[PDB]
């Protein structure tokens, strides 16, 4: 993060150790379950590019999912070079931060109109993250069914948590949520969501499912 | 949270890591027991509409819960855009942290006439955590009867456990605490507690029911 | 609790995640053992009656006892309400803070001659947790006696750990260790105690008796 | 402990929770082995009364061992009010905290000249405490002998182990490190002792003895 | 690390407690796989040579390897006097904190042209690391090849993970990633990753291999 | 430690609870395995003679160990007094921290010439456990030697894990680390050693020797 020393000039406060743990915790342990970008930005809150690094290059595990998301921080850090022709004007692959020190990134970051490059770097990171999470998602929406025994509480929280990861706009969703959620629902269960009609809420679908 | 700099000027706090992985324990461990409301009132005390969207976000499991408190809060921000129409003047999103700034957030939470959006997104939350916690009870308070060998402070311990998720006002809840709570006990019990008459408390219920 | 604010106004501070983990453990695993007076006591240090709320609706198990715990706050809310009729003067319930605001109760906890409503409502939930260790009490101090076989200590850790929980006022403690401790202890021990005469410390009594 | 306030006044400062965890782990735990009064005294370095006594009413189990410090503190507190015939003039029972308000505590502890009422009663709770670590410690030191083929370490570590607990004074305790440790070891190590002379250090004894 | 004191002078922060457990942890358990030189880099963000040599020193396995970094530090050091021929003028041994006091060692870092003796030892320290990881490695990239029955993200994780302990410059871990990645895939997988042609990201190759 | 007071004069800090406990768990568990040392300077870093006795006597087992620590400290004590025949002058027993206040040794610790009892007594804690690290050894380096199965990483481990508790000068770790390494490896790996000649470094050997 960046904090103002008590002299009166911008200073680096390193990620803390806590917060490091907590984060490879996370990566190893929910291997890129979609709850892993909400981690990431509240634990990356303040980061800068260095900070960012280094919650990247801690994780020991998944380095497939690592490579992707270093070349999908290349190819971000590449369009970026070519919106932004040539403190200094920083390169993609400053605001990676590759190719510039600590105090540049401090520097910018605190610059009078501020070049916020760990918001920046964050969102180029969240977008590698969000390209692993839909892949390491081991089933996609079409293929979420009910069993003939299953609660309708269990199958609505496996629909929504592939639909987390489903790449889709909001439009889609929507209508994945009305369409596919009853379509894919058991035969006894479907009747009963079929009963309330296209305008039913998920509260609604599952209250009058409940027990089935 | 929110903390005013050393330069004079209001400033976000981020959410703890050791915050969010409480609240996360809380939420995958409890299964919204209804003990969850005031472990996230607890827990959320200064919180921004971001930080309350981190809170909501980072929870992996109870994708079913999660949507229902989502279209939850999406009907208490349609009904706040309906009761207000058109800093800015905050419209539903803008509250549910979805279409404004951390910036626009603390701005409205520190302004001359604070305009507290976190708090009243909070109110929707718990709305929405309310709801959950109704459905997620696996029982209704009307069921809860006491078995012929159990001892009556485990019935008791059940019948206030579930009157907790019930809906109902007070004064229905009143009512079931006078009748309901004498009406499913055990013939032997049933015996005891109607000889104390209608005004007994609990303490004298259960002290009079005590090895019974 | 509450801290001066460096704009040089009172303001509140949110009770620590780490307090009310620690609180709950206390009461889910201690399960109203004595030491839990002291617990709430300790953790519930500096607290206004958001707190004190906090603390007590965060309990997710034993709503037999938390139920008893609310009417015993009640009934003291009440008597406050009849020994104090009509900043605003605090209602009791004001006092237990549920009429009252988070401003209203640092209002008057701040106020120049300070109505410190958090030491109030404390009392008042400590007078229910004292009711509540009684009535949890697995057995009573005259029926605590001494194995043949026990250990003279295991028997005064028994005795005391009994004693603790016990209604009555000192004087009858005090009665309670001279007569009952000796009159039940078993037909070996007993003789060795009655050999010191009425006089004993009970590090004279336990040394004594040691080994036999 | 004490804290002063950024207003210009002496405050209290609660004692930790996690404080408080790590005495209740010490005390149940080690169950008052002689390394409890070094705890006792690190993490109670600041106490006010009222903090010792949070220390002490948070035990839990040993309750006969907390009688014991009880009414040993009760004896100091007499001879105190013996010795000081009469802020106030602190009786014993205000120093132990029990009769004083915690403004008086921190009014005596922070007078002109300091009247240090915390470091008093924390003097008196050590000698109940060592009365207590001398009563629980389960042999005494002439009984500590060397089996015929225990490790001179092993038997070391029991004597000095021992050693701690036992009541006598330095020039006592000097004596049973020169004579009853050799005169106490096995057969065939008491020799290699011997051979010393009377002037061997422990560190010569343990060397010259190792794997005897 | 450094901190400022409130009296207007530079002063030292010791490494907290919980880094060195981190720290410890990191090296006993992850036993100098790669993401070992990332939290060297993390935990150490602000540390004076004495902090440095801390991490090190209370490293008790692997003492092979710690001695391999050590000899590794007196070459640089040994490079360092060679380049630098005689505040003092820090030899190499004084940059590596053992012929340097710490207020050497904060004169240095804090004076106004800053000779960041941290900094270089640190550079010091994570090549030895890498000499460390290297060797540690318990395969080469070309050994690491795809299993019949193997998933093809399995093996990414492998390759990427061995490719992080490899010598080579990028411009030689680019030619692995374009040509060994294919050449050592399975005859079923290899098929597929040919016919995508050279250019194939990773996850383009992931994507096409999926459940193959 | 010792921290300034915002009243502008030196004050104690008391040693954490997470210090002792961190520092207890060393000593208990690695039982005087060689990092123990810099365990201690790294967790004892700013300790006044007070804050390092508490790490002494707070340590439970070993007090064979710890006796031998108070007495290296008594002779360190003597010869300090006869060096320094006589704020006070400090005796070596008040250095020690036992005829000391803790407002002396804070007196000298920030005295304007600073007399630094802290680090003095913790050289000669450093001193004392030194012996007992050595003594605590379960073998010495002559007698460690390579198994005919066992890697040579695994001896080389053996070897330095107990060259750091032996005793003597670096010119005699000089020549045990180039001859005895060689001379005690196994019948074939010594081949492969001598084959690099006198000037191979300890990463030649391991290389060279990885496999064997």
Do not use: C, F
């Given at each position: 993060?960046?904090?103002?020393?008590?002299?009166?000039?911008?200073?680096?406060?390193?990620?803390?150790?806590?917060?490091?743990?907590?984060?490879v915790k996370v990566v190893e342990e929910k291997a890129f379950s979609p709850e892993v970008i909400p981690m990431f930005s509240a634990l990356s809150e303040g980061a800068t590019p260095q900070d960012l690094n280094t919650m990247l290059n801690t994780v020991g595990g998944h380095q497939a999912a690592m490579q992707m998301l270093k070349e999908t921080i290349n190819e971000e850090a590449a369009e970026w070079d070519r919106?932004?022709?040539?403190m200094r004007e920083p390169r993609g692959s400053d605001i990676a931060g590759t190719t510039s020190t600590?105090?540049?990134?401090?520097?910018?970051?605190?610059?009078?109109?501020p070049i916020p490059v760990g918001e920046i770097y964050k969102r180029w990171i969240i977008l590698g993250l969000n390209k692993i999470?839909?892949?390491?998602?081991?089933?996609?929406?079409?293929?979420?069914?009910?069993?003939?025994?299953?609660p309708f509480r269990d199958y609505v929280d496996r629909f929504y948590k592939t639909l987390r990861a489903?790449?889709?706009?909001?439009?889609?969703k929507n209508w994945m949520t009305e369409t596919l959620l009853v379509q894919n629902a058991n035969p006894d269960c479907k009747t009963i969501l079929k009963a309330l009609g296209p305008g039913a809420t998920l509260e609604e679908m599952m209250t009058a499912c409940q027990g089935v």
């Open positions: 993060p960046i904090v103002q020393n008590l002299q009166g000039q911008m200073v680096h406060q390193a990620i803390s150790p806590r917060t490091l743990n907590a984060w919106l932004h022709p040539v600590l105090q540049e990134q401090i520097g910018w970051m605190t610059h009078n109109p999470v839909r892949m390491y998602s081991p089933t996609s929406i079409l293929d979420i069914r009910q069993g003939p025994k299953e489903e790449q889709a706009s909001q439009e889609v």
